[PDB]
Every structure is written in C-alpha cells, then in structure tokens.
Amino acid sequence: PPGPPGPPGPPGPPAPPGPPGPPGPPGPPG
Amino acid sequence: PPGPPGPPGPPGPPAPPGPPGPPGPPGPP
Amino acid sequence: PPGPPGPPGPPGPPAPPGPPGPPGPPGPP
C-alpha cells in the first residue's frame, strides 16, 4: 500500500522554435 | 492505494527546422 | 489498484537550425 505504480507519463512537448539557418550563397554577377 | 504515480514519460517528439538564414554576400562585380 | 499516470516526459530534441538563406544581391556594376 499504496498499490502498484502507475503507467509511465505521456511524451514530453517539442523543444522551442529552432535557430535560423546559415547565410545563403553569394549574389549574381555585376 | 492508489499505488504511487508512474515515472516520467518519454522525451518529446522532434521539432521542425528553424527559419531560413540571411541572404548571402553581394555577388561578384 | 495502481496509482496515476506519470508526469509528462521531458522536452524533445532541439529543433534543427533552418534552411540556408537566399542568394545575395548582385555585385558592383
């Protein structure tokens, strides 16, 4: 007593919004 | 009773990618 | 009788970084 332990908990939440990516490639010719 | 609470559930799901990165440098002159 | 469900599991994996940015602006004339 109490009794047997309950089931595991639910899946956690997502991690916050991710960082932006790296810079794009160079621009076009002049 | 009730028995004690169960343990923590599993880690959360994968998240979406972050936002696009900054434009790159000016092209060639 | 078995106790209550366990608490929520921890945060998921870090959301990846975003896709690369766009090409830059044209170069000097």
Method used to solve the structure: X-ray
Residues of C with CB under 8 A from a CB of B: 1-29
Contact C10, A9 (CB under 8 A): no
Q: How many CB atoms lie within 10 A of CB A5?
A: 16
Resolution to 1 decimal place, in Å: 1.9
CB C12 within 8 A of CB A13: yes
- Please say whether the beta carbons of B28 and A29 come within 8 A: yes
Q: How many CB pairs under 8 A join A and C?
A: 93
Which residues, at least 6 apart from B6, have a Cβ–Cβ distance to it below 8 Å? A5, A6, A7, A8, A9, C2, C3, C4, C5, C6
